């Protein structure tokens, strides 16, 4: 059941991406 | 160094070009 | 082949289709002659 | 194949087409 | 203006200097047409000059002569090129005409007036004049219709066209009864482009071809008249960008699409592109190999309808996913093939096993051998065969040249379409030269988060 | 003239390259 | 002997371009 | 002005390379086989070098 | 002073900068490049690989090369005055001395060029990031052209300086090492493709967020401390398109330094691995499963088969010194083909 | 009356919809091209994930020998893939509703066709979307061209090549190992390495990475001291500032002394144009190469081109690479071929 | 299977109609310089 680990890692990456997009700290103009 | 470099590249280039043309006419 | 008459015009025809390319190249020549390119 | 497909396609298309026609008016 | 200072464009983008100069632009177009007709003539005379009587066209690297042969000039029954003189005639005509168009081009480009709106009013135009543009469009559309009717006339009355499906092998035939039924023609139009369907590339009889050209002729003429005598509706006026570059981009998209379509015609169709002239298709060649070894092994005493391959599928004969009896092996992918040398053996449920056992003709075997040995595979330096093949056969099928070249062209033409459409939008709105430092849109927008 | 020099030189280069391309069809390396 | 004819014709066309340009460059 | 010495040396070098090939001196210099020297009357196989420290005597044969 | 005068002369502002680094760089660079031309034009590989290798023999630019030394030479440095050629230039070329010549002079040439980057950087007064970035390519050359053959039997299996020859090295490493399956190589591919991506996207973005600093359609002429493009507009655009955008120019430029360079370094790790035949060739789990279960198939196993084919057939021609004889009955192949 | 018809249509419902669709205030821009893109990419993504994890083996070569591609069927990340549709289907449209059951669909490789078509559509729409947002924000519109290069590549390996070869089974597998397989077979049957357009592609990516590293190193080298020691120099730049953050003259000078004076760029606009142009053209050409080789105009064939006086073949490196090509050719799809020539 | 076809056809026709009629709604006017 290495499939569990692979799925876990993939879900991890996708979650990281999701939070990188919708939970980024907003860029602020000088 | 300008002369040395420019000629360093250009002289053999012409030599080789002649050679290779000559090769274009070598038959089996 | 070509009709026997125009047989004598074989080599010239061999160069005929290469002419449009020359025109392209000519453009650059023209430009270089002017001062641009 | 069946008439149902054409019916639905033409239905949705006509609906959005009318929406657009109102907009154009 | 012919400088960066006077126009704003550099010597490269040099050609953009002609956008608002009607005269020189017309000169450019005419001269270019001159180049096209030049190439047509010169290359045709080249192909006639290099042609050898007792060899197939596709072995000699011909792409123009197969078109003329398809139209029915100098062809004997079977696809034998006997008379090579009409080709010479067309080549000469095109060449001389190229002299005329060339003269006109150089004149309007260098000698004549830059602006045709001053001295003239019929040949002058503003890009923003919708009526004039639709008028020109209408005229040229009518011209295209006339051309379609030229093909129709040529095929109905003047000798006819080469029919590879002709009852008795490929032969020139006058199309007596063309197809005018809208159900059929437009059945082509509204059909899938996928396997077994083929959209408009799947046309397999000259009746439907010529009838289709009747329909397209009528359509182009009626549309030409329509655009000449009308003005664009409100919605079209609101939806489109009205400028020269925009029109250029539209024609570019169109020509990209057409390029792709032509590549597909050259690659799959063998009716408008007879295999006698253009060579076999990939499908046709693969099927030809399967057929060939089916015949060979059947002659060696094998019951091919019962011959089990390594996989468990038929070695020579199997079934298509919809039940039809087809040739086995990889060529199972090519079971949609229709070829005049194979259809004699075709039945209602696919290949007729009885006819396969009994009625296979020598000429069919010759066709299969020839085609499987002239498959459209070859290197860039024209080494015939698969990539691992050795240097002996000098051959690359005309189908490969045509299809690849026109994919190249269609592709880059699409790129040009994106480029010019984008620049058309940006130039219309007014920011094609950069962002206004005093009117930067983003600075007037609420931040994203 | 600079442009005439560039043109002549370019023609020369293209001629030599053309000779090489011809050489791919003749003599050694031509499969003949 | 056909090759020489071909190369002569080629030379003439190729030269034809630049000659027109040079000629007009004088005027 | 500087085209003279170049008109006397550039063609000279060009012809010198040409002669370097046409006289066949290149073959003798770089040990490159002539189109008729790949296989002799004695050897019909590829003449690979097998001895590292005796490559001279091996190449002589 | 003497040394000070030397330094003054060497660091003069010429059309081509020299420097101390120039003392090392220019000779070796010249000799490497020249050896490549000399070899690809005149020298053959008949006595090393049994191959024609030069223009003189009929090779074109694609098939010509300076091939690796004979396998029998081992890891010999193959000096011209070495105990193998013994001064004889002809026998030297026939052995494959030009390969070691090109390789060593090329190596010291790379050292000299990197030192040149450092030197010019220090003289001008810049940060030496160009040299570091260049440590990348160096790692590639050292690992592939030096370490890999040094780990193997001889220089013979090192890449030959030529197009089709390099292609051979490629397919060789695929068939024998399953190099595509190696994660380090995958990181390399990530580095290169990512680098090209960054180059393209940065170029396009800057070109399409330009400020109107002129009236001409030729925006090139209209170019100072002011930014020539709108960073804010770019940020907005890529944030709404891709979800994430750059905000810091310095971080951006460092990033498109970092990605490709890292790629190169990683793939180098991989290549060292292959120098010792320490491959990422197989997945034991799938090999065992496939051994016990004849219905189990993945693209991995298919590629394993492909490797086996490559190895047989080419094995006979690519390694002539081995005298491999494979009867046509033992060559692995499928039905019909 | 000029080019653009500058006019509005008075807070209509359809106009409100068009406004929201084309809104530049949305966190993610959803243009009309997005009206196409979002559903396509979502369907494609869902089917891809579900299949990559749990899809049963697929009879790719139509020879009734199903290949396993999913994780729950013995694959890992590297070997797992979405197996291309059956060669028995070829270029036939095979939607779910044309199969008798989902099981059949899974067996014949329907997922691949679905995912490929939807993905290509959605990615084309992605390109159009890049243009669209560029237009809405008053930008120059040529980012989508740059992106047109990768789209062309994807279209080449997922659509055009199957068209030229007559089957989606020849399309590139959606997976790592499958990709490698695609590459190897492609080399065997087109000799792509000896194709000048692929060489152009390699020039595009190698050169792209080179110029990326070069530009990066140059700008990073000439950063102006705005930061303290041991602190991140990135903090020395602020988003939106107008002052340049590096010494362009110093960089140009360095580059000028590295090679020679006239080898360096002075115009940053020219430099970045070049940076955008080189790899995009490279990739364009390689994409074209994949498609034109999709119609069997293969790479340069120099097999046995060199002959000796007696008439015997003298091999070159092209012959060796031909040996490798032969290996791949004879070994690939061992049970698929019944006849001596591989024409499909 | 037919109902699925009907569903998918409905979706495709829907989004295609929105696309076409959407891009017909004076799109060139949708720019910051208007
Ligand atoms: C832009 C990027 C867009 C990316 C893709 C966007 C998403 C598209 C989603 C759907 C795509 C479906 C494509 C199917 C094309 C195809 O299979 O086309 C095949 C068809 C022909 O079909 C064939 O038609 C044949 C007809 O021959 C038959 O009939 C003949 C009559 O003589 C003969 O008898 C012959 O022997 C006999 O078999 C058979 O039916 C075959 O089975 C059948 O496959 O061609 C045709 O319909 C015409 C094809 C038109 C062009 C196809 C698209 C090309 C796009 C290229 C973009 C490049 C630039 C990108 C830049 C970014
Ligand atoms: C086949 C394509 C084509 C065509 C039809 C044209 C046509 C034209 N170009 Mg153009 N151009 C082309 C390719 C083409 N160009 C290319 C490839 C480039 C390189 C980027 C340019 C760069 C360019 C620039 C920079 C400019 C033009 C301009 C022009 C126009 C005026 C020409 C002029 O005054 O020259 C006069 C030329 C001569 C007097 C010498 C040529 C005489 C004849 C043709 C010699 C032919 C020999 C004969 C046929 C047989 C031998 C004309 C309509 C100009 C323009 O629009 O300004 C208003 C302009 O400024 N072009
Ligand atoms: C219907 C065809 C068509 C027409 C009429 C135009 C017309 C125009 N284009 Mg355009 N374009 C087209 C197709 C077309 N394009 C295609 C298919 C593409 C995609 C490749 C482009 C990409 C393009 C760009 C990127 C740009 C233009 C621009 C322009 C404008 C100036 C062009 C110019 O000066 O050329 C100058 C001509 C040259 C410099 C010659 C270049 C030759 C190329 C690079 C090599 C092609 C290889 C060739 C096939 C053979 C190789 C030679 C070999 C034998 C030695 C002008 C309005 C410019 C613009 O927007 O200005 C408003 C601009 O920047 N075009
Ligand atoms: C696309 C085709 C085309 C078009 C639209 C035009 C259009 C025009 N030509 Mg023309 N021309 C063409 C092809 C074309 N030409 C060709 C192929 C040649 C070579 C035989 C000429 C040779 C030609 C000459 C010699 C003259 C025109 C002139 C004219 C203008 C007035 C002619 C008139 O009203 O009758 C008009 C703008 C006249 C003009 O512009 O004078 C100012 C003029 O004197 N044309
Ligand atoms: C009623 C007016 C009228 C007519 C009859 C034409 C006719 C033509 N124009 Mg034209 N044009 C017009 C107004 C008109 N134009 C206006 C107002 C403008 C804006 C200034 C232009 C701008 C323009 C450009 C820029 C170009 C043309 C071109 C052409 C030719 C197309 C050739 C081709 O391949 O088509 C398709 C051909 C066929 C389908 C074959 C049959 C066509 C008919 C039946 C006969 C063709 C014979 C011969 C070509 C000319 C005789 C035509 C005449 C007897 C009607 C054609 C001669 C093109 C060209 O190359 O000109 C030489 C071109 O590049 N035109
Ligand atoms: C020569 C080509 C040509 C060109 C450039 C134009 C150009 C134009 N026409 Mg036109 N037209 C033509 C030929 C042409 N026409 C012909 C031959 C006819 C019939 C005889 C018409 C009949 C016609 C009418 C009746 C009207 C126009 C209108 C217009 C204008 C609006 C265009 C528009 O919104 O299109 C957008 C078009 C569509 C969205 C229609 C979709 C096409 C359907 C779906 C069939 C295609 C399906 C097909 C099977 C698949 C194709 C494959 C492809 C998608 C890859 C524009 C100026 C309009 C206008 O402004 O009034 C003057 C208008 O009311 N035209
Ligand atoms: C409908 C629209 C759909 C859009 C497509 C979805 C796009 C998703 C993009 C996610 C980006 C995540 C960035 C995290 C990291 C992050 O949040 O960085 C944020 C960062 C912001 O940089 P700043 O300029 O603000 O940094 C200033 C200082 O903090 C620097 O130290 O963005 C970048 O550095 C640009 C490079 C991003 C490009 C990264 C591409 C990676 C692709 C994904 C690879 C793995 C995929 C695995 C799949 C199994
Ligand atoms: C605008 C311009 C341009 C362009 C131009 C062009 C493109 C032109 C063209 C032109 C042309 C396009 C021309 C044509 C001509 C043609 C001709 C001149 C023809 C002739 C013919 C002949 C001579 C024939 C003869 C014969 C016969 C009769 C038959 C038999 C055989 C023979 C051969 C004997 C450029 C860019 C450069 C720049 C400047 C400006
Ligand atoms: C001859 C022939 C035939 C026939 C043909 C025909 C009859 C055709 C037709 C065709 C057609 C009839 C076509 C059409 C097309 C159309 C199109 C292609 C369209 C397009 C569109 C567009 C492009 C649009 C766009 C847009 C949008 C969508 C959005 C808004 C804006 C705009 C408007 C821009 C047959 C097959 C029998 C056989 C073969 C030969
Ligand atoms: C080894 C050795 C050495 C050395 C020597 C040397 C250093 C040599 C050199 C050599 C050289 C230094 C050579 C050169 C060559 C060159 C060449 C061979 C060239 C070619 C060219 C071409 C082929 C062209 C191309 C092109 C371009 C550039 C671009 C555009 C296109 C075209 C194609 C035109 C010594 C004695 C010290 C010692 C012993 C050993
Ligand atoms: C029909 C005929 C005829 C006519 C012909 C013709 C029409 C010709 C033309 C020709 C031509 C039309 C030529 C042209 C040429 C051109 C050229 C030759 C150009 C150029 C070249 C080059 C080489 C360039 C280079 C360059 C430059 C300067 C710039 C850029 C850079 C480069 C370096 C690339 C005759 C009378 C014989 C009679 C018979 C038939
Ligand atoms: O399916 Mn995938 O790979 Ca194109 O080639 Mn024929 O088919 Mn199969 O063999 Mn080789
Ligand atoms: Cl088969
Ligand atoms: Fe930058």
Name the helix (H) or strand (E) containing J102: helix J102-108
Closest residue by CA, ligand 9 atom 11: E189
What are φ and ψ of residue E232, in 5° steps?
A: -55, 135
Interface E–I counts its CB contacts (< 8 A) at 55
Q: In whole angstroms, what is the distance from residue E134 CA to residue E21 CA?
A: 19
Contact J212, I256 (CB under 8 A): yes
Which CA distances in Å does J142 have to D3, J147, J212? 45, 9, 20
3-state secondary structure of C25: helix
From residue I237, how far is each of C5, E311, I125, I231, J135 by CA, in Å? Answer: 69, 55, 36, 10, 10
Name beta bridge partners: E140. Answer: none
CA of E248 to the centre of ligand 3 (A): 12
Closest ligand 1 atom to Cα of E265: 45
Nearest-angstrom CA–CA distance, J293 and E377: 9
Paired tokens of E252: 């570019």
CA distance E440 to J139: 10
DSSP I127-192: -THHHHHHHHHHHHHHIIIIIHHHHSS-GGGSPPEEHHHHHHHHHHHHHHH-GGG-HHHHHHHHHH
d(CA E106, CA E100): 10
The conformation of residue F9, written as its DSSP 8-state character, comes to H
The residues with which I65 forms a beta bridge, in sequence order, are I162
Nearest ligand atom owner, CA of I252: 7
DSSP J295: T
- CA-CA distances (angstroms) from residue J171 to D16, E181, J38, J50? 37, 38, 24, 20
Tokens of C32: 């270089």
What is the secondary structure of J307-328 as a DSSP string?
B-TTS-B---HHHHHHHHHHHH
Give phi and psi for E173, each to the nearest 5. -145, 140
Provide the CA H32 distance to its chain's centre, in angstroms: 5
Say if CB J85 and CB J169 are below 8 A apart: yes
Q: Comparing C-alpha atoms, which of E159, E142, E157 is closest to residue E68?
A: E159
The token duo for J124 is 């084309």
Strand bridging mode E75-76 / E80-81: antiparallel
Distance of CA J257 to the CA centre of its chain: 37
Gap between the Cα atoms of H8 and H4, Å rounded: 6
E197, E289, E383: residue with CB nearest J339:
E289
Find how far residue F3's CA is from the centre of its chain.
20
Would the CA dihedral through J177, J179, J182, J188 be positive or negative? Answer: negative
Backbone torsion region of residue J226, taken as left when φ is above 0, otherwise alpha when ψ lies between -120 and 50, otherwise beta: alpha
Which of C:1-37 have CB within 8 Å of G? 10-12, 14-15, 18-19, 22-23, 25-26, 29-30, 33
**Which helix (H) or strand (E) segment is J143 a member of?**
helix J143-146
Ligand 1 centre distance from Cα of residue E193 (Å) = 5
User: What's the burial of J70, exposed, middle or buried (CB within 10 Å: 0-12/13-18/19+)?
Assistant: buried
Phi-psi domain of I50 (left: phi exceeds 0; alpha: psi -120 through 50; beta: other): left
Task: Order the strands of the E317-319 sheet from edge to edge.
Answer: E317-319, E325-327, E350-351, E346-347
For CA atoms J15, J18, J20, J26, give the dihedral sign: negative
Number of residues in chain K: 34
Buried b (16+ CB within 10 A) or exposed e, E180-203: eeeeebeebeeeeebbbebeebbb
Spatial distance between the Cα atoms of I307 and I313, rounded to a whole number of angstroms:
10
For the beta carbon of residue E83, count every other beta carbon within 10 angstroms. 11
**Residue of B14, B21, B22 with shortest CB distance to H13:** B14
DSSP collapsed to 3 states, chain E:
CCCHHHHCCCCCHHHHHHCCCHHHHHHHHHHHHHHHHHHHHHHHHHHHHHCCCCCCHHHCCCCCHHHHHHHCCCEECCCEECCCHHHHHHHHHHHHHHHHHHHHHHHHHHHCCCCCCCCCCCCCCCCCCHHHHHHHHHHHHHHHHHHHHHHHHHHHCCCCEEECCCCCCCEEECCCCCCCCHHHHHHHHCCCCCCCCCCCCCCCCHHHHHHHHHHHHHHHHHHHHHHHCCCCCHHHHHHCCCCHHHHHHHHHHHHHHHHHHHHHHHHHCCCCCCHHHHCCCHHHHHHHHHHHHHHHHHHCCCCHHHCECCCCCECCEEECCCCCEEECCHHHHHCCCCCCCCHHHEECCEECHHHHHHCCCHHHHHHHHHHHCCCCCEECCCEECCCCCCCCCECCCHHHHHHHHHHHHHHHHHHHHHHHHHHHHHHHHCCCCCECCCCCHHHHCCCCC
CB–CB of B5/I16 below 8 Å?
yes
CB E435, CB I230: distance < 8 Å: yes
Q: Are J72 and E319 in contact (CB under 8 A)?
A: no
Tell me whether residue F26 is exposed, middle or buried, using C-beta atoms within 10 angstroms of its C-beta: 0 to 12, 13 to 18, 19 or more. middle
Q: Which residues of J touch D16 (CB under 8 A)?
A: none
What token pair was written down for E379? 């290197």
For residue I297 the two structure tokens come to 């198939």
Distance of CA I124 to CAs E334, E443, I131, J29, J229, Å? 67, 39, 14, 46, 21
Query: What angle do the packed helices I299-318 and J176-190 form, to 10 degrees?
Result: 40
| Alpha-carbon gap, residue F8 to F13, rounded angstroms | 9
* C-beta of residue I304 within 8 angstroms of C-beta of residue I177: no
J10, β-bridge pairs: none
Residues K11, J39: C-beta atoms closer than 8 Å: yes
Q: Does C29 touch chain F (CB under 8 A)?
A: yes
Q: Which ranges of chain I does DSSP label H, i.e. alpha helix?
A: 2-10, 19-41, 89-95, 97-124, 129-142, 148-151, 163-177, 183-207, 231-241, 249-275, 284-292, 299-318
Please, are residues E32 and E52 in contact by the beta-carbon 8 Å criterion? no
Q: How many degrees, rounded to 5, is the angle at CA J16 between CA J10 and CA J22? A: 115
Q: I294: how many CB neighbours lie within 10 A of its CB?
A: 7
Q: Residue J152's CB: how many other CB atoms inside 10 A?
A: 23
E419 lines ligand 3 (CB under 6 A): yes
How far off is chain D from K7, nearest CA to CA, in Å? 9
Tokens 């015997």, located at residue: J312
Residues in a beta bridge with E9 = none
Q: Are E255 and E410 in contact (CB under 8 A)?
A: yes
Among J41, J24, J7, J20, CA closest to J132: J24
Angle in degrees, CA A2, A8, A12, rounded to 5: 150
Residues 6+ apart with CB under 8 A from E428: E241, E243, E246, J3, J4, K28
Instruction: Say which residues have a Cβ less than 8 Å from residue F5's Cβ, sequence separation at least 6.
Output: none
Return d(Cα I289, Cα I297) in angstroms, integer: 9
Partnered with residue I210 across adjacent β-strands are I229
Written as six digits, the tokens of E13 are 């983008």
Q: For residue E72, which of E52, E94, E90 has the smallest C-alpha distance? A: E90
Which technique was used to obtain these atomic coordinates?
X-ray
Residues contacting E122, CB < 8 A, separation 6+:
none
Task: Give CA–CA dist J295/E377, Å, rounded.
Answer: 8
Resolution in A: 2.8
Instruction: For residue J124, count other CB atoms closer than 10 A to its CB.
Output: 18
Q: Is residue J305 within 8 Å of I58, Cβ to Cβ?
A: yes
Task: Measure CA J131 to chain center.
Answer: 19
What is the rounded distance in angstroms from the CA atom of residue J23 to the CA atom of residue J17?
10
Ligand nearest to the CA of J125: 1
Inter-residue long-range contacts of H39-47, CB under 8 Å, 24+ positions, other chains counted: H39/J308, H39/J310, H39/J312, H46/I46, H46/I50, H46/I320, H47/I46, H47/I47
């Amino acid at each position: 059941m290495e499939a569990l680990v692979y799925v876990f890692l993939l879900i991890g990456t996708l979650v990281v991406i999701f939070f990188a997009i919708f939970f980024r700290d907003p860029p602020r103009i000088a | 160094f300008r002369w040395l470099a420019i000629h360093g590249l250009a002289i053999p280039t012409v030599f080789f070009f002649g050679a290779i043309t000559a090769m274009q006419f070598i038959q089996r | 082949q070509l009709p026997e008459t125009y047989n004598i015009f074989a080599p010239i025809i061999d160069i005929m289709p290469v002419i449009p390319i020359l025109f392209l190249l000519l453009a650059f020549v023209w430009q270089a002659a002017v001062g641009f390119r | 194949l069946l008439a149902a497909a054409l019916a639905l396609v033409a239905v949705v298309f006509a609906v959005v087409l009318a929406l657009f026609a109102a907009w154009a008016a | 203006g012919r400088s960066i200072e006077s126009t704003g464009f550099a010597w490269w983008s040099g050609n953009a200097r002609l956008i608002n100069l009607s005269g020189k632009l017309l000169g450019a177009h005419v001269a270019h047409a001159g180049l096209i007709v030049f190439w047509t003539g010169a290359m045709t005379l080249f192909e006639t000059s290099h042609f050898i009587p007792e060899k197939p066209l596709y072995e000699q690297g011909m792409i123009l002569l197969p078109h003329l042969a398809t139209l029915g000039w100098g062809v004997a029954p079977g696809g034998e090129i006997v008379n090579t003189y009409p080709y010479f005639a067309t080549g000469v005509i095109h060449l001389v005409s190229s002299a005329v168009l060339g003269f006109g081009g150089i004149y309007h480009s260098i000698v004549g007036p830059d602006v045709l709106e001053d001295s003239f009013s019929f040949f002058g135009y503003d890009w923003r004049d919708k009526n004039k543009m639709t008028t020109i469009l209408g005229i040229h559309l009518i011209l295209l219709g006339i051309g379609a009717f030229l093909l129709v006339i040529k095929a109905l009355f003047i000798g006819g066209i080469y029919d590879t499906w002709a009852p008795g092998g490929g032969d020139i035939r006058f199309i007596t009864n063309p197809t005018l039924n809208p159900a059929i023609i437009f059945s082509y139009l509204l059909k899938s482009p996928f396997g077994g369907e083929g959209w408009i590339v799947g046309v397999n009889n000259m009746e439907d071809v010529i009838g289709g050209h009747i329909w397209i002729g009528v359509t182009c003429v009626i549309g030409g008249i329509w655009h000449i005598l009308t003005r664009p509706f409100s919605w079209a006026r609101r939806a489109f960008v009205w400028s020269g570059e925009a029109y250029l981009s539209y024609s570019l998209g169109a020509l990209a699409l057409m390029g792709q379509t032509a590549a597909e015609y050259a690659w799959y169709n063998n009716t408008v592109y007879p295999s006698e002239f253009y060579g076999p298709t990939a499908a046709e060649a693969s099927q030809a190999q399967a057929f060939t070894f089916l015949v060979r092994d059947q002659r060696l005493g094998a019951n091919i309808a019962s011959t089990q391959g390594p996989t468990g599928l038929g070695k020579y004969l199997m079934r298509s996913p919809t039940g039809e009896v087809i040739l086995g092996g990889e060529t199972m992918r090519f079971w949609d093939l229709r070829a005049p040398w194979l259809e004699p053996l075709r039945s209602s449920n696919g290949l007729d096993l009885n006819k396969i056992k009994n009625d296979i003709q020598p000429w069919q075997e010759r066709r299969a051998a020839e085609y499987m040995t002239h498959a459209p595979l070859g290197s860039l330096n024209s080494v015939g065969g698969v990539a691992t093949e050795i240097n002996s056969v000098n051959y690359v099928s005309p189908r490969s040249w045509l299809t690849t070249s026109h994919f190249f062209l269609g592709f880059f033409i699409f790129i040009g379409h994106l480029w010019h459409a984008g620049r058309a939008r940006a130039a219309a709105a007014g920011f094609e030269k950069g962002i206004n430092r005093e009117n930067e849109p983003v600075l007037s927008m609420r931040p994203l988060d | 003239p600079l442009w005439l020099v560039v043109t002549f030189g370019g023609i020369v280069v293209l001629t030599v390259l053309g000779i090489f391309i011809y050489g791919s069809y003749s003599g050694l390396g031509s499969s003949l | 002997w056909q090759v020489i004819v071909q190369l002569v014709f080629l030379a003439l066309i190729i030269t034809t371009g630049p000659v027109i340009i040079v000629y007009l460059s004088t005027r | 002005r500087y085209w003279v010495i170049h008109s006397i040396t550039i063609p000279s070098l060009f012809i010198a390379g040409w002669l370097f090939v046409s006289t066949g001196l290149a073959y003798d210099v770089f040990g490159t086989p002539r189109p008729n020297e790949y296989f002799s009357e004695n050897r019909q196989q590829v003449p690979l070098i097998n001895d590292r420290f005796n490559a001279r005597e091996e190449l002589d044969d | 002073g003497w040394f000070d005068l030397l330094d003054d002369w060497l660091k003069r502002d010429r059309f081509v900068f020299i420097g101390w680094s120039g003392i090392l760089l220019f000779p070796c660079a010249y000799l490497a490049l020249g050896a490549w031309f000399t070899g690809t034009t005149f020298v053959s590989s008949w006595y090393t690989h049994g191959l024609a290798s030069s223009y003189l023999e009929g090779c074109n630019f694609l098939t010509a090369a300076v091939s690796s030394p004979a396998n029998s030479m081992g890891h010999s440095l193959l000096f011209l005055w070495g105990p193998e050629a013994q001064g004889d230039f002809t026998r030297w070329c026939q052995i494959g001395g030009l390969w070691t010549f090109t390789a060593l002079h090329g190596s010291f040439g790379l050292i000299g060029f990197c030192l040149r980057q450092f030197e010019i950087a220090r003289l001008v007064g810049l940060r030496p990031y160009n040299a570091i970035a260049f440590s990348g390519p160096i790692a590639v050359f050292v690992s592939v052209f030096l370490l890999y053959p040094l780990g193997q039997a001889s220089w013979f299996f090192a890449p030959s300086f030529g197009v089709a020859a390099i292609f051979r090295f490629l397919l060789f490493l695929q068939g024998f090492h399953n190099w595509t399956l190696n994660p380090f190589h995958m990181m390399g591919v990530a580095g290169i493709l990512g680098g090209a991506l960054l180059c393209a996207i940065h170029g396009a973005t800057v070109e399409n967020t330009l400020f109107e600093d002129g009236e001409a359609s030729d925006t090139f002429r209209a170019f100072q401390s002011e930014e020539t493009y709108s960073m804010v507009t770019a940020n907005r655009f890529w944030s709404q398109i891709f979800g994430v955008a750059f905000a810091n120019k310095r971080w951006l430029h460092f990033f498109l330094l970092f990605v490709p360079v890292t790629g190169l370094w990683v793939s180098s790790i991989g290549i060292v691995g292959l120098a010792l035949n320490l491959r990422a060739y197989d997945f034991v789990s799938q090999e065992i499963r496939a051994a016990e279960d004849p219905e189990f198939e993945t693209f991995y196993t298919k590629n394993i088969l492909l490797n086996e084919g490559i190895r047989a057939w080419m094995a006979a021609q690519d390694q002539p010194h081995e005298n491999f004889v494979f009867p046509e009955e033992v060559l692995p192949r499928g039905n019909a083909l | 009356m000029t080019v653009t018809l500058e006019r509005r249509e008075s807070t209509s419902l359809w106009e409100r919809f068009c406004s929201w669709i084309t809104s530049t205030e949305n966190r993610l821009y959803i243009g009309w091209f997005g009206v196409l893109m979002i559903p396509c990419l979502l369907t494609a993504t869902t089917v891809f994930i579900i299949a990559f994890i749990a899809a049963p083996p697929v009879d790719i070569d139509g020879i009734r020998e199903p290949v396993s591609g999913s994780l729950l069927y013995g694959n890992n990340i590297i070997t797992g893939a979405v197996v291309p549709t059956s060669n028995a289907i070829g270029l036939h449209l095979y939607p779910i509703w044309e199969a008798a059951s989902l099981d059949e669909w899974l067996y014949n490789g329907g997922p691949y066709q679905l995912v490929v078509l939807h993905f290509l559509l959605g990615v084309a729409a992605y390109m159009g979307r890049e243009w669209e947002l560029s237009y809405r924000l008053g930008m120059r519109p040529w980012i989508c061209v740059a992106f047109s290069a990768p789209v062309a590549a994807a279209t080449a390996v997922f659509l055009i090549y199957p068209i030229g070869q007559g089957s989606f089974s020849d399309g590139m597998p959606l997976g790592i190992s499958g990709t490698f397989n695609f590459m190897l077979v492609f080399q065997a049957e087109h000799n792509i390495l000896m194709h000048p357009f692929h060489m152009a592609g390699v020039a595009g990516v190698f050169g792209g990475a080179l110029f990326s590293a070069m530009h990066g190193s140059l700008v990073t080298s000439s950063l102006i001291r705005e930061t303290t020691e041991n602190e991140s120099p990135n903090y020395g730049y602020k988003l939106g500032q107008e002052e340049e953050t590096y010494n362009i003259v110093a960089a140009h000078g360095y580059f000028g002394r590295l090679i020679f004076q006239y080898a360096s760029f002075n115009n940053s606009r020219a430099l970045h144009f070049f940076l955008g142009l080189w790899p995009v053209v490279g990739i364009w050409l390689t994409s074209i190469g994949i498609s034109t080789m999709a119609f069997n105009l293969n790479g340069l064939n120099f097999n046995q081109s060199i002959v000796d006086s007696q008439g015997r073949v003298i091999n070159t490196w092209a012959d060796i690479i031909n040996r490798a090509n032969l290996g791949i050719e004879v070994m690939h799809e061992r049970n698929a071929h019944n006849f001596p020539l591989d024409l499909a | 299977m037919f109902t699925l076809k009907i569903f998918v056809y409905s979706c495709v026709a829907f989004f295609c109609s929105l696309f076409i009629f959407g891009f017909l709604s004076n799109d060139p006017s949708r720019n910051p310089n208007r």
